[PDB]
Amino acid sequence: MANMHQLLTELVNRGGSDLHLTTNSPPQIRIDGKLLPLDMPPLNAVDTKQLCYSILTEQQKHKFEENNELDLSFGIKGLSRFRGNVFVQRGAVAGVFRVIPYKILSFEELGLPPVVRELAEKPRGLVLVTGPTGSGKSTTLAAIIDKINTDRHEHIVTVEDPIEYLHPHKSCVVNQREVGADTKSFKNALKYILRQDPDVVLVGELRDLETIEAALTLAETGHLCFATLHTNSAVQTINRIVDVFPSYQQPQVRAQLSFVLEGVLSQTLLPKASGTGRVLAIEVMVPNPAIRNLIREDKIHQIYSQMQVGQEKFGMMTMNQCLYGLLQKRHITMDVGMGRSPDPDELKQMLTS
Amino acid sequence: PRGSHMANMHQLLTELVNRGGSDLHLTTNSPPQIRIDGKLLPLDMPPLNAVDTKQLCYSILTEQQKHKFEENNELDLSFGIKGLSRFRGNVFVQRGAVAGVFRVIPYKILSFEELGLPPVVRELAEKPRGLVLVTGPTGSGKSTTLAAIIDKINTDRHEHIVTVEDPIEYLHPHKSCVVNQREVGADTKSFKNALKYILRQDPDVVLVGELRDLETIEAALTLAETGHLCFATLHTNSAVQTINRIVDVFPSYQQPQVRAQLSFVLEGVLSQTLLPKASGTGRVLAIEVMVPNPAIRNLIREDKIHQIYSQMQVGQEKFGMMTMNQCLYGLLQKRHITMDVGMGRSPDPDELKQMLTSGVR
Amino acid sequence: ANMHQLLTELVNRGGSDLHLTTNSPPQIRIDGKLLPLDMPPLNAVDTKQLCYSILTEQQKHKFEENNELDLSFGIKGLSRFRGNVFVQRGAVAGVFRVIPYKILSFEELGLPPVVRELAEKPRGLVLVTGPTGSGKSTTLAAIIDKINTDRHEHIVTVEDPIEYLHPHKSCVVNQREVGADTKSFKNALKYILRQDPDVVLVGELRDLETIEAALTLAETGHLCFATLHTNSAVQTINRIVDVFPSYQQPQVRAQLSFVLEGVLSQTLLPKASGTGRVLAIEVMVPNPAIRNLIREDKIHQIYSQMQVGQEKFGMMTMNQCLYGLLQKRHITMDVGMGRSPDPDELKQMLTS
Amino acid sequence: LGLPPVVRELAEKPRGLVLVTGPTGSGKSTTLAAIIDKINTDRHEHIVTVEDPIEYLHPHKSCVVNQREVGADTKSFKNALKYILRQDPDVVLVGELRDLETIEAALTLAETGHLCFATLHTNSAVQT
Ligand SMILES: Nc1ncnc2c1ncn2[C@@H]1O[C@H](COP(=O)(O)OP(=O)(O)O)[C@@H](O)[C@H]1O
Ligand SMILES: Nc1ncnc2c1ncn2[C@@H]1O[C@H](COP(=O)(O)OP(=O)(O)O)[C@@H](O)[C@H]1O
Ligand SMILES: Nc1ncnc2c1ncn2[C@@H]1O[C@H](COP(=O)(O)OP(=O)(O)O)[C@@H](O)[C@H]1O
Ligand SMILES: Nc1ncnc2c1ncn2[C@@H]1O[C@H](COP(=O)(O)OP(=O)(O)O)[C@@H](O)[C@H]1O
């Protein structure tokens, strides 16, 4: 048998993101998005209770037994910090434990093109980093924020659920607010953010109509606003913001977006061709004079054609062009690149070319 | 006058399985009774009293389950007997005494073809993300279809499946996935509470049960929008009727967001019903299948929900779609259902009449 | 002593309810009408002692807190009764109903032979309707008891309260009383499908949620019995349809057309002898024409179908039942005309 | 402040609801302080402000200016506006129209012959 400390050590050593402990299965660790069972006997109810309780204080145990649910974060000296969730299934304890990295990675390490570096220099605008869950959005935002913290003498405020990467003060003052502990909600944090003299604000996901307008106000009133969406492309991102409003407001919102939008990044993590690790495929839309006019005229669909031809001038890049490069460098397999292309026949034409 | 040598609960359930029974009954003033081929037959035992039924039923409850049963006088649960079988138990109260009913739960989950599900349902189980809705009235095969879908995912993927059920019906032992199943009223306090913590539990596939209220619908859309495969049920009878229920439960001012979200995340709508079989034994599945294509996704954003039915009529060949009448037509050519049942259940009897008279079949 | 002697009078004269209130002698309900006993009137002292003489100590403290109290109690050698005690004009008053225990047979109840066939249906919805005290529970108790004798199936009843008691015969019979065995009609039906039933009695179709349960039970392969307070078959079907919002009446009409197997609308009318009551019942048994009429929303046309499906299917309109009681001279013309839903047609039907 | 001449004429309106709206930090309180100061300078009336918190202070000039801070001077907007009609006011500043309760109170003040000033976070007249 192995205890909780040995299991967490193996999760870190193998570069995994998540450790799962549940009954009738061995401990499993998520490596590169897919689960892998550890070389251990299947757990029983005693094991899951013993392993999960081994990292809890007495009050955390008593709170867990009152609700059969528990969110927490904890540290193991000399290893890493982890965020754990404990719950109950089939009458037995179960647990999931997520890694919180100590180290912020650089732009080049993450495979982010240099145009993302320039967005950290934007004085006032809205920059959106979008993608499905676990597509690298938070790491890219943390990479941009750390460069601003390093390079500017301004005030950075983040509202996060939860706070992942920690930003010690460099040249900036960095305040990080965790929803549910430091602040009641995004709505509450955003209710007072304009009285907090911010320069750059990270608001998390544009969850509802009220948060879209709040992010638009910051970027339009002279601030640099960072936000995320769960869209898969630059065009789909712009459409989702506009389409949630009633049609007769929509004209105003397109005009505000055209002025404040300074960059849209859409990420996805694909399994590498070597069989270890994941590689970043990203679509980058940086508004040029042509695209900002297309936004105001509700000619959003001509943007894709403009992104296809504005790469050398503005550092723009369609998703298919990014997949193309990962195919040329043999970073991804042929099936993986096809499986994510929004238009596989277009990418096929590029490949035969 | 007989005492001190009563059959054990373990022994009663062991005899239930060995004799091929479907259900074990424990109630006062009756001996244990077993259902064989649909009919109850008493075992050659003395009749049970209230002490017997409570002691037998309590022998298979955890201490937390006894307290939950005593608070509501109702209790559904599942348990395993090592080396024998799994069981669904229901404990209730009648005439002031404990009563219990215990159903046999087979080890083998039925396949798509055994259930009469078209091959398009198979492909919905391969979706990497999105929302899949399985609809129909109570007992129209919704849970069984979902059990078949999750089981293929359990077999094929190395991902995390979490289900929230009230109660847990079909049980999913681990295959290639890690499967966590939370039972409302025992494992978790409520649907609302389980969904509040699910995103911190690293899920890939989630079963959320019925889209009961506005809170749950918003939770399922978030799961489906954030890159997850989310399974849910409604009690609507058609793909078009299903979409109308989702949008219309929301205030009018946020229907635009709901309509936009559905067009992106919706990957399939299955509307089932069980009709009495033509053979005279059992019921057979008639299912309407809507798989959103770019054309259907546009009608959702443009508030043209009504026009989707015309698209399903002509999406059978290309998209594997199937209107309810198109399924009833196929069941009639196969002589699986009678004519009165086919016409009497058709949502549009005029279309089905036209479909049969083609002379081209 | 005094109250125990009073309740024996109630049983011996065959009454249904005993009334105790100030400025009146004790009154007992016989055949639907109150009859005063040849006794002195009760004062406030009398009603208090009589009602309190049958109360437990916990019940005494409970009644004075609310001026209301529900209870049931037994009198050794007589019967059990359900009582309600309350306060009026500053004094205690009480009403006591008899809980019948002996189930009468189908023929003793005046039920036609077609009702006997209903207890042999394997699945569907059967509705027994009528005002309060129109004979629904005896009819239901007779039906349930025959199933218990003839079948090896599972009978579950949910009652508020339990009236007739059904010991196990060939069936397993579980009886759940609301407020003791189960919290509510809604809670019992939440678990009923997981209790492996074959025949279920759900009581009154009082709201939308219970109707969905009865229709679900009936189309999922069970025989479900339920009650309404309507006085005819058409009236009964309309009440089920009109409870729902307009946009789902097509689904409910479709459900009803398949699962409905019988509608019994009863009323107890005084016999021409002047002592006792005879049952008048409208029976609607769906034939292919009627089932189509329900789904096609031609519900008003159903009454015409019942008048001519009589010989073949055992059907009987209320007027046809009233004709027979008039032809056999069991009830008076005033009683028969008073219950006829269309007295002029009965007149045409009576004289040919 | 760059305010057009119509803003000064609004400060001379005898009655009604005048709304100065915009996002936070768009100059709403500064414009209101200039209006109230002009009213305070030119009129012999009673000004009551309900602010959360009090920003600009208005010492008495020709008007009587009472400024109530919520949480210290008064328990809430809801409680302060419940008694504002009993305080013989001519001009009332109620702050932001944050909920249904204050909006109906501000509409009642402006309906009963007072000049009421309030704010919203809207960006245009129609949107307001
Ligand atoms: N550019 C990247 N390249 C490779 N891996 C990345 C990259 N960005 C993030 N990751 C890794 O993906 C996993 C999830 O990252 P995260 O940013 O938290 O996802 P999300 O943005 O959807 O919340 C982590 O293990 C992280 O190290
Ligand atoms: N596709 C199907 N075809 C035939 N029978 C089915 C099918 N699905 C389920 N059944 C059977 O019908 C019954 C009801 O199905 P179930 O999904 O459990 O109820 P519900 O969908 O109303 O919640 C089950 O006992 C099952 O054996
Ligand atoms: N078919 C019947 N014929 C003669 N008497 C009946 C008949 N049905 C019921 N009764 C008597 O009338 C009384 C009312 O019956 P009950 O079923 O308890 O009321 P309800 O139908 O309103 O629930 C019973 O006590 C019963 O003895
Ligand atoms: N009409 C104006 N013209 C120029 N600057 C102004 C004007 N109004 C306010 N300001 C300046 O803008 C800043 C914000 O003013 P403030 O009243 O506090 O915000 P708000 O109107 O949203 O309450 C102040 O520092 C002020 O100096």
- The domain limits of chain A are 1-103, 104-353
Task: Read off the tokens for C238.
Answer: 């309309």
Closest CA to B297 of B338, B335, B267, B256: B267
Contact B184, B164 (CB under 8 A): yes
The breaks in chain B (C to N more than 2.5 Å) occur after none
Contact B122, B114 (CB under 8 A): no
Closest CA to A282 of A41, A171, A116: A116
Task: Give the amino acid at A89.
Answer: Q
- The strand ranges marked E within B277-328 are 283-290
Residue listed under structure tokens 């195919």: A327
CA distance B77 to A91: 10
Resolution (Å) of this entry: 3.3
CA distance C110 to C276: 12
Contact A94, B161 (CB under 8 A): no
Task: Please confirm whether the linkage preceding C41 is cis (ω < 30° from 0).
Answer: no
Backbone Cα Rg of chain A: 22
Task: Read off the tokens for A265.
Answer: 């990044």
CA distance A123 to B358: 69
CA distances (Å), B328 to each of B275, B338, B351, in order?
A: 10, 10, 11
Task: Read off the tokens for A136.
Answer: 């690298």
Pairing state of beta strands A28-31 and A18-21? Answer: antiparallel
Pairing state of beta strands C277-284 and D91-96? Answer: unpaired
Phi, psi (degrees; rounded to nearest 5) at B283: -120, 150
In chain C the first and final C-alpha atoms are separated, in Å, by 59
Backbone Cα Rg of chain D: 14
DSSP letter for C104, please: P
Task: Give the amino acid at C28.
Answer: I
CA distance B324 to B345: 9
Contact B87, B78 (CB under 8 A): yes
Closest CA to C314 of C119, C115, C127: C115
Residues whose CB falls within 8 Å of the CB of residue D21, separated by 6 or more in sequence, listed in order: D28, D119, D120, D121, D122, D123, D128
Task: Read off the tokens for B322.
Answer: 């199937």
In chain D the first and final C-alpha atoms are separated, in Å, by 22
In this complex, the residue of C174, C194, C216 whose CB is nearest that of residue B88 is C194
Q: What is the dihedral of CA A120, A122, A126, A131, to 10 degrees?
A: -30
Does B40 sit within 8 Å of C171, measured CB to CB? Answer: yes
Q: SS in 3 state form for C266-334?
A: EEEEECCCCCCEEEEEEEECCCHHHHHHHHCCCHHHHHHHHHHCHHHHCCECHHHHHHHHHHCCCCCHH
Pocket of ligand 2 (CB under 6 A): B 115-116, 138-145, 169, 274, 283, 285
Residue listed under structure tokens 């106000």: A217
Task: Read off the tokens for B331.
Answer: 């069941």
Phi, psi (degrees; rounded to nearest 5) at D122: -80, 160
Task: Read off the tokens for C242.
Answer: 């009109």
State whether residue A69 sits within 8 Å of chain B by CB. Answer: yes
Contact A20, A95 (CB under 8 A): yes
> In sequence order, which ranges of chain D are alpha helices (DSSP H)?
5-10, 28-42, 77-83, 100-111
- Distance, CA of C79 to chain centre: 20
Residues whose CB falls within 8 Å of the CB of residue C294, separated by 6 or more in sequence, listed in order: C237, C253, C256, C257, C260, C286, C302
CA distances (Å), C34 to each of A218, C10, C81, in order?
A: 81, 12, 18
Contact A86, B180 (CB under 8 A): no
CA distances (Å), A291 to each of A236, A247, A309, C263, in order?
A: 14, 21, 11, 71
Task: Read off the tokens for A175.
Answer: 């305040």
Establish whether A138 is an annotated binding residue: yes
Task: Give the amino acid at A336.
Answer: V
Closest CA to C96 of C37, C160, C155, C17: C17
Residue listed under structure tokens 């983040």: A158
Pairing state of beta strands A155-160 and A173-178? Answer: parallel
Sign, Cα dihedral of C79, C83, C89, C90: positive
Q: Which of C162, C200, C219, C223 to mutate to test the interface with B (most CBs of B within 10 A)?
A: C219
Neighboring chains of A (3 or more beta-carbon pairs < 8 A): B, D
Task: Name the burial class of residue D100, with classes exposed (0-12), middle (13-18) and buried (19+) by CB atoms within 10 angstroms of its CB.
Answer: exposed
Task: Give the amino acid at B263.
Answer: S
CA distance A321 to A308: 8
Closest CA to A218 of A159, A167, A147, A284: A159
Name the region of B103 (left: φ>0; alpha: ψ -120 to 50; beta: rest).
beta
Long-range Cβ contacts of C254-257 (<8 Å, 24+ apart)? C254/B344, C254/B345, C254/C295, C255/C215, C255/C218, C255/C219, C256/C125, C256/C215, C256/C294, C257/B344, C257/C286, C257/C291, C257/C292, C257/C294, C257/C295
Give the nearest chain A residue to D98 (CA atoms): A191
Task: Read off the tokens for D101.
Answer: 């309760």
State whether residue A103 sits within 8 Å of chain B by CB. Answer: no
CA distance A67 to A31: 30
Beta-bridge partner residues of A87: A69, A94
Residues of A in contact with B65 (CB under 8 A): 91
Q: What is the dihedral of CA A326, A330, A334, A335, to 10 degrees?
A: -80
Phi, psi (degrees; rounded to nearest 5) at A217: -65, -45
Domain A1-103 listed as CATH 3.30.450.90: yes
Closest CA to A31 of A162, A103, A134, A102: A134
CA distance C285 to C302: 11
CA distance B230 to C288: 43
Task: Read off the tokens for C228.
Answer: 């309404």
Neighbours of C163 (CB within 10 A): 18
Structure determined by: X-ray
- DSSP characters for B247-269? HHTS-TTTHHHHHHHHHHHEEEE
Residues whose CB falls within 8 Å of the CB of residue D22, separated by 6 or more in sequence, listed in order: D28, D119, D121, D122, D123
CA distance C110 to A293: 87
Give the number of the atom of ligand 1 that is nearest the alpha carbon of residue A139: 17
Nearest CA of chain B to the CA of A216: how many Å? Answer: 17
Domain B109-361 listed as CATH 3.40.50.800: no
Sign, Cα dihedral of C236, C242, C247, C248: negative
Task: Give the amino acid at B333.
Answer: Q
- DSSP characters for A27-49? -EEEETTEEEE-SSPPB-HHHHH
- Of 3.40.50.20, 3.30.450.90, 3.40.50.300, 3.40.50.450, the CATH number of B1-108 is 3.30.450.90
Which residues 236-255 of A are in CB contact (within 8 Å) with B? 236, 240, 243-246
Beta-bridge partner residues of C280: C267
Residues of A in contact with D26 (CB under 8 A): 221
CA distance A134 to B227: 9
- The strand ranges marked E within chain A are 18-21, 28-31, 34-37, 69-76, 80-89, 92-100, 125-130, 155-160, 173-178, 200-205, 224-229, 261-271, 278-285
Beta-bridge partner residues of A279: A270
The C-alpha angle A98, A145, A285, rounded to 5 degrees, equals 100
Task: Please confirm whether the linkage preceding D53 is cis (ω < 30° from 0).
Answer: yes
Residues whose CB falls within 8 Å of the CB of residue C351, separated by 6 or more in sequence, listed in order: none
Beta-bridge partner residues of B210: B233
Does B189 sit within 8 Å of A91, measured CB to CB? Answer: no
Residues in chain C: 352
- Distance, CA of A307 to chain centre: 23
Task: Read off the tokens for A104.
Answer: 């912020």
Contact C268, C279 (CB under 8 A): yes
Three-class DSSP category at C339: helix
Contact B289, B120 (CB under 8 A): yes
CA distances (Å), B217 to each of B58, B193, B211, B220, B249, in order?
A: 37, 14, 6, 5, 9
- Of 3.40.630.10, 3.30.450.90, 3.40.50.2000, 3.30.2020.10, the CATH number of C1-102 is 3.30.450.90
CA distances (Å), C198 to each of A199, B141, B279, in order?
A: 70, 19, 21
Sign, Cα dihedral of B344, B348, B352, B358: positive
Q: Which fold has domain C103-352?
A: Rossmann fold (3.40.50)
Closest CA to A266 of A307, A224, A219, A327: A307
- Distance, CA of B182 to chain centre: 15
Three-class DSSP category at C227: strand
Pairing state of beta strands B39-42 and B33-36? Answer: antiparallel
Three-class DSSP category at A175: strand
Contact B158, B174 (CB under 8 A): no
Pairing state of beta strands D115-119 and D16-19? Answer: parallel
Does A133 sit within 8 Å of B226, measured CB to CB? Answer: yes
Q: Kindly state the greatest CA–CA separation across chain C.
A: 65
Residue listed under structure tokens 């298979």: B60
Task: Read off the tokens for B94.
Answer: 């009648």
Binding-site residues of B for Mg(2+), please? 143, 169
- What is the layout of strands, in order, in the sheet containing B85-94? B39-42, B33-36, B23-26, B97-105, B85-94, B74-81
User: A104-353: which CATH architecture?
Assistant: 3-Layer(aba) Sandwich (3.40)
Contact B129, B227 (CB under 8 A): yes
Contact A246, A253 (CB under 8 A): no
D68's enclosing H/E stretch is strand D64-69
Which of the listed residues C96, C268, C283 should we mutate to test ligand 3's pocket, taking the one with most ligand atoms within 8 A of CB? Answer: C268
Residues whose CB falls within 8 Å of the CB of residue C138, separated by 6 or more in sequence, listed in order: C100, C103, C104, C109, C164
Contact A338, A311 (CB under 8 A): no
Does C190 sit within 8 Å of B92, measured CB to CB? Answer: no
Contact C32, C49 (CB under 8 A): no
In chain B the first and final C-alpha atoms are separated, in Å, by 71
CA distance B147 to C30: 59
Contact C11, C79 (CB under 8 A): yes
Task: Read off the tokens for B99.
Answer: 């009563």
